[PDB]
Amino acid sequence: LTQPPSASGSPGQSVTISCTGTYNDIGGYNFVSWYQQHAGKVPKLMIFEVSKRPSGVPDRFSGSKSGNTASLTVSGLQAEDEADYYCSSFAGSNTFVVFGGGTKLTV
Template sequence: QSALTQPASVSGSPGQSITISCTGTSSDVGAYDYVSWYQHHPGKAPKIIIYDVTQRPSGVSDRFSASKSDNRASLTISGLQAEDEADYYCCSYVRGVTWVFGGGTKVTVL
């Protein structure tokens, strides 16, 4: 159960768009359409922002979008805002009702 691979950090200026990648294998990301993304402000509970690869929960800004191709998933944040500065984690369902997270990406708003 190796962690999914994410870049350690991504930065952008307010208003810009950034994309975070999440690379797994044919046993996790590539096997199921059950990739989710979580926003985590340190000291707070993580918050789901994307589920089932592309779905946004009610109340989550439409500035967040996501996709998947083969073993790689991506999260895009459009119109970057100061409040988007946080850690972001991808997560994939794995066979046997288990899960694996990515290593996390720190997003910095310049």
């Protein structure tokens, strides 16, 4: 599963990270989640379903999927968001879960 190595923007800026799949992984199934990981920390689920956010996550975090591409948007970027973002998805039952590499976002 493919992710860019980095992303960036000014605090207060809308910054996005994209992920590309296939007709499995992202595409095929509506099970694309995103994680926020600061160095030394345990990855926090930011996005649960393609667009659905879990409790405990601020509303600056949202996302969607089009075709085979998933997108994470952080609207109103904060300094506290300097973390890697990872996307993962249901890979189908033989692989079950697939992850992309992390995209490091700089504020």
